[PDB]
Write a protein that binds this DNA or RNA. Structure first.
Lengths: 113, 161, 85, 49, 115, 186, 205, 166
RNA sequence: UUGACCUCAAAUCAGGUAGGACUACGCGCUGAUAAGCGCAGGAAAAGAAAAUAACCAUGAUUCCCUCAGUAACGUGAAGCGGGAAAAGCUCAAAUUUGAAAUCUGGCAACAUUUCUUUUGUUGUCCGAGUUGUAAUUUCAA
RNA sequence: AUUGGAUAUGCCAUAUAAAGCGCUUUCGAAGAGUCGAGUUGCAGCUCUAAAUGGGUGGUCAUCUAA
């Protein structure tokens, strides 16, 4: 088992060309070996992925600068979104009840004085 | 209490009184007559069966039987059987006698032939003899029923005896 | 333990075509003709729009196993109709 | 509306189709009659026919 | 919406009575037929033995009882169970061969036409 | 017009105005008047015995047996035309029939629609004749669907080899393209 | 003809028999996530999977997916390439639902995302073969139908103690990474030598 | 016989022959009544297979049903069984359809006829337990509808079981 | 002119048949299980595997205890095991083709009765049935 | 007095018959607008199969629906 030489040969058989542009590749791997060892802390790995993503987003946008592609999309553009419309309407209504408790949290804590 | 049953009680016509329920009278034996003799009506079923020699079940019993007194390899199984399992208490031995003498007069199964069945074989046997039955399934005329090579011998035993 | 080889159940022989049933289907295959999508496929199997032909059978039948069985079914018709006609 | 594709029934098959052998009851007197005769023959001895 | 068990002494006796009324007709023959010995199928119970449904078609052929004369003399048949190993077959021939050794079938009168 | 007659002329014409498939198209082209008067003349010897007078010969067979005589030893194999749909499909598959006759008015037409295809394959000369009831009169029935000669005696073999040659030469030898094209739409 | 308007990345989202509604919603989420895929009808040959190559040859696809619903109890996933390639079966569980109120990402349908690959995948050649395969699978090729040129999603791949943790994030102008909603615990099981066939390359242990 | 050929022909329902008889008979079935008696079964093989013997007492009906929510075949068993109050339902099969109507037939058996009553293969239906079988969901398609089969696919807890000794 | 056959009608024709009531328990229908609708019996539904299992295999259905408040997702099983009871089978699909061997009905005799009230046999004449009634067989073969 | 399955026995029966199991140089038919896929509230609509096939479960095991 674990025939890495054959896997490397498979990596040679599935060897995507390095001459492809980063915009053409549509991928930016984190240069640092990002290892968030906090298996217990989910918030630690969430920010580490965000930090590695931000490091990638900085590198990808720089690579997109060479590609001269519109990294930012127009807000006036009304193209198809990944998120559904009715679910997003319920998503905004879901956050209304959370801030309502937070508003009552800040008011009552200030009312404790 | 009920509309149906307020009716009969407020009336003056007697209820259809049917006394039909007493326990402890365990159903008397019919079907067999010998077991009707040695049955005692008060004793339960499993105490009659295992007194006069027989079983209520050949399998296991799923309970603790009554105790009243302080009681003190494939070649040899597909061929050899257990013995006759001889009879105790003489009533399962009486059942031996009824099951042998009835099958002693109703044992003979010889069949006399009919007038035709005798003559049909008679005509066949005088044309080829009394041994070569196997070619009589190839006889054109006298085997008009197209009988077997075996079936003619079946009648031929019935011919003599 | 000392395991035996058992014979086959006489019910496991369901799904095996006889010589009399295969002669029944062959007769009725032509005397009933072809359905108003199976006329379409026979044209596309004749002028070799093979990838287009297999695309329609999957869409109409539902499953490749059926969508391959027809191919094998209908291609036998054309290769036997070139000797009849 | 095409013509008639007789791709299969174009030729003639020479063999029979069912292969189970000819039974013996097609080469002898009809044993259903022979039973039927004995019902009538019995009926004469009882004097109903 | 309950399930009250006040009849539980009564179903015991009703079963007891109807098990004695079963025996009234069958006075010389058992109230239940002989069941085979079959091993339970799970990993948990495969060392146990218990009564099953009936004797297979080759447990019964090997003992001398045809499938047609079987259910007359009170021997259940299971057309579904099959004997995978000899041990499943040698154990149950010695259920039949003891049963035939201990059983006495009363004879009957036949209908041979005379004259 | 009554409530049903205006259907009774319209299902006459909708069989004409529509597109008849070549399997059904041959069920209106039919054996003619002339050659459909000799087929039934040959068959009118080989009718099945009327059920009343089969019994009549059975009481005359069962009276001598009650005395001692017999005729089963000298009974020669009988003859008649063979009828019934399920008995004649097996008489063609076994290549026993020699002249199959198909009615032209079987109400569910699927009952006989495989027979002109089966007779073409098994090499049994066939013809489609009119009036299922006309076959029914042959065999003492109300409506027959098909008949078949499988064996005439040595008397009419020479007649049968001639009358079949009229059946192929008029039905099978002709009608060869109207069975291979759609019908109706008149 | 044999190839016209040819996109490099063509995938087939073939389900299995017995996926729950929540188990099916994630598959339809990846259908929306991967616009370079073509979802087909279910294959009732739930174990004869070696004949799926012709189905890929019918649609002229390049990527495959057979989300085998294990025993109608769990949910699995396997993927391969049209010409033999790596057929690496994996186990999928602990997925973040894409229809819940917790996920609050903002991404566009068909937007070419940015995929992030960890060096742990680049460490083992067995994972490196999977990493490049993952680079070719989740990424849309050049010129996909109904695709968007801009980037609205951010894919982050982190092997959480031997199990790849999917992380689809949506960026905002400042990178402001906010989870789009697609996130599942993907533990690899094995790898076949060819296209859902051939000898086993490795058991994962 | 002919029933072998007539089963395999009845499966090729969309082919030219099976489609031509579909258009023709849907015309005649539509000008007739909504429920009208047959004299012969249109499919004399399916009827023969589903139980119909061609003797006196076996009555074939046929009924169109509107398409487009009880299963249509089940209602064809009920609506014929409410039109015949004496006949006992055996089965009901499919014979034709179009864009607006499904046509079925039904096999019905007279329980009072002293030819059914003397026949020990159909004598189970003279018994009074079989009164309006199509009502109780007790027939070929009323069993399939209510998930009565054998398989993991297809008050007993809601009551507390309080024994004497516990 | 005439005769079959198909279809459709008519009859205070001959003989039968269906409603309606009870609805504790049964089975369906839709349904906020409740209500409403429909349909039977002394029981009914279920039923002799297009069933489980992964074993040294079990063996129609029903029911009780257990599995178990367990797996699976507040809801909530099922296999196994332990009991009670155990009875199996009938058609379609192969030509009776050396013989429609099948059955309803009308009439007349002979019986027979829970019964002058019941239920049959035999003879006879139509009729049903070859678009298939009997014998044979149901995969265990 | 009505009725049960039996026991013995009398008369009839029609048996030229029927059945069990060896033995096979032979044959061995198996249920469709159903299964199935897509899709709306097990039903609806669109489409529509096959013969070692088809179903349900781990290449195997086990079953034989309409």
């Amino acid at each position: 088992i674990n025939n890495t030489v054959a896997l490397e040969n498979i990596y040679e058989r599935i060897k995507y060309p390095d001459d492809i542009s980063f915009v053409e590749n549509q991928a930016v791997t984190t240069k640092e070996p990002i290892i968030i060892e906090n298996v217990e802390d989910d918030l630690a790995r969430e920010l580490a992925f965000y930090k590695q993503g931000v490091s990638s987003v900085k590198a990808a946008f720089a690579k997109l600068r060479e590609a001269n592609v519109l990294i930012s999309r127009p807000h006036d553009y009304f193209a198809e979104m990944l998120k559904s419309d009715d679910h997003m309407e319920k998503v905004r209504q879901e956050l209304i009840k959370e801030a309502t408790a937070k508003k009552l949290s800040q008011q009552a804590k200030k009312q404790r004085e | 209490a009920n509309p149906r049953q307020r009716n009969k009680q407020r009336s003056g016509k007697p209820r259809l009184t049917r006394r039909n329920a007493n326990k402890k009278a365990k159903a008397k034996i019919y079907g067999n007559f010998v077991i009707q003799q040695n049955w005692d009506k008060h004793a339960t079923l499993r105490q009659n069966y295992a007194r006069l020699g027989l079983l209520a079940t050949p399998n296991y019993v799923t309970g603790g039987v009554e105790k009243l007194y302080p009681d003190p390899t494939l070649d040899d199984v597909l061929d050899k059987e257990i013995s006759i399992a001889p009879a105790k208490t003489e009533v399962v031995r009486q059942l031996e006698e009824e099951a042998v003498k009835k099958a002693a007069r109703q044992s003979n199964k010889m069949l006399p032939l009919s007038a035709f069945e005798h003559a049909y074989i008679q005509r066949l046997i005088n044309k080829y003899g009394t041994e070569d039955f196997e070619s009589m399934a190839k006889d054109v005329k006298l085997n008009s029923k197209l009988f077997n090579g075996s079936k003619l011998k079946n009648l031929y035993i019935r011919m003599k005896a | 333990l000392t395991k035996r080889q058992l014979p086959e159940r006489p019910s496991r022989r369901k799904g095996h075509l006889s010589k009399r049933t295969a002669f029944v289907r062959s007769i009725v295959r032509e005397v009933a003709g072809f359905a108003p999508y199976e006329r379409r496929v026979m044209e596309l199997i004749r002028n070799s729009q093979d990838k287009r032909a297999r695309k329609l059978a999957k869409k109409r039948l539902g499953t490749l196993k059926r969508a391959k069985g027809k191919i094998e079914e209908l291609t036998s018709v054309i290769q036997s109709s070139r000797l009849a006609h | 509306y095409p013509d008639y594709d007789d791709f299969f029934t174009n030729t003639v098959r020479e063999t029979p189709l069912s292969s189970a052998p000819e039974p013996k009851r097609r080469f002898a007197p009809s044993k259903h009659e022979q039973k039927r005769i004995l019902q009538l023959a019995y009926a004469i001895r009882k004097g109903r026919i | 919406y309950v399930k009250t068990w006040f009849n539980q002494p009564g179903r015991k006796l009703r079963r007891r009575q109807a098990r004695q009324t079963k025996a009234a007709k069958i006075a010389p023959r058992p109230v239940e037929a002989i069941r085979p010995a079959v091993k339970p199928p799970t990993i948990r119970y495969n060392m146990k033995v218990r009564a099953g449904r009936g004797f297979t078609l080759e447990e019964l052929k090997a003992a001398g009882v045809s499938r047609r004369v079987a259910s007359t003399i009170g021997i259940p048949v299971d057309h579904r169970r099959r004997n995978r190993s000899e041990e499943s077959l040698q154990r149950n021939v010695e259920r039949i061969k003891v049963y035939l050794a201990h059983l006495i079938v009363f004879p009957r009168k036949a209908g041979q036409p005379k004259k | 017009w009554p409530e049903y007659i205006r259907l009774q002329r319209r299902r006459k014409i909708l069989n004409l105005r529509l597109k008849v498939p070549p399997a059904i198209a041959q069920f209106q082209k039919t054996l003619d008047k002339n050659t459909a008067t000799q087929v039934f003349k040959l068959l009118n010897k080989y009718r099945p015995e009327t059920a009343a007078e089969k019994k009549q010969r059975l009481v005359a067979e069962a009276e001598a047996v009650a005395n001692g005589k017999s005729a089963q030893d000298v009974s020669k194999k009988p003859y008649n035309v063979k009828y019934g749909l399920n008995h004649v499909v097996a008489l063609i598959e076994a290549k026993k029939a020699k002249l199959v006759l198909i009615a032209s008015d079987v109400d569910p037409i699927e009952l006989v629609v495989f027979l002109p295809a089966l007779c073409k394959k098994m090499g049994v000369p066939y013809a489609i004749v009119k009036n299922k009831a006309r076959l029914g009169t042959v065999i003492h029935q109300k409506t027959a669907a098909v008949l078949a000669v499988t064996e005439v005696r040595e008397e009419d073999k020479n007649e049968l080899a001639s009358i079949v040659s009229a059946v192929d030469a008029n039905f099978s030898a002709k009608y060869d393209e109207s069975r291979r094209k759609w019908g109706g739409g008149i | 003809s044999a190839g016209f308007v040819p996109i490099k990345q063509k995938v087939l989202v073939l389900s299995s028999r017995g996926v729950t509604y929540r188990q099916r919603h994630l598959l339809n989420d990846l259908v929306s996530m991967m616009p370079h895929s073509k979802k087909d009808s279910k294959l009732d040959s739930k174990d004869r999977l070696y004949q799926l190559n012709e189905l890929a040859e019918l649609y002229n696809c390049n990527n495959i997916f057979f989300f085998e619903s294990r025993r109608r109890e769990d949910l699995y996933l396997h993927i391969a390439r049209a010409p033999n390639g790596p057929t690496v079966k994996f186990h999928v569980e602990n997925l973040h639902t894409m229809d819940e109120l917790n996920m609050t990402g903002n991404a566009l349908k068909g937007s070419r995302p940015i995929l992030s690959f960890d060096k742990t995948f680049d460490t083992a050649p067995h994972l490196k073969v999977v990493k490049e395969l993952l680079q070719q699978t989740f990424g849309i090729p050049k010129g996909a139908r109904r695709s968007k040129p801009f980037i609205d999603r951010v894919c982050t791949l982190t092997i959480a103690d031997g199990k790849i943790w999917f992380r689809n994030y949506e960026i905002r102008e400042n990178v402001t990474l906010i989870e789009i909603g697609p996130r599942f615990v993907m533990t690899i099981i094995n790898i076949l030598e060819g296209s859902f066939g051939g000898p086993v390359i490795y058991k994962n242990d | 016989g002919a029933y072998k050929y007539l089963e395999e022909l009845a499966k090729k329902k969309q082919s030219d022959v099976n489609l031509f008889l579909s258009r023709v008979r849907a015309w005649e079935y539509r000008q007739m009544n909504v429920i009208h008696r047959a004299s012969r079964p249109s499919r004399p093989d399916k009827a023969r297979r589903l139980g119909y013997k061609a003797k006196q007492g076996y009555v074939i009906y046929r009924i169109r049903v509107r398409r487009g929510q009880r299963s249509a075949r089940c209602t064809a068993e009920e609506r014929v069984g409410r039109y015949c109050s004496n006949l006992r339902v055996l089965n009901s099969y499919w014979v034709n359809q179009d864009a607006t109507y499904k046509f079925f037939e039904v096999i019905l058996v007279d329980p009072s006829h002293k030819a059914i009553r003397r026949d020990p293969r159909i004598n189970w239906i003279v018994n009074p337990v079989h009164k309006h079988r199509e009502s109780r969901g007790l027939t070929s398609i009323g069993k399939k509808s209510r998930g009565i089969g054998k398989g993991h696919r297809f008050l007993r807890h809601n009551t507390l079981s309080l024994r004497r000794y516990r």
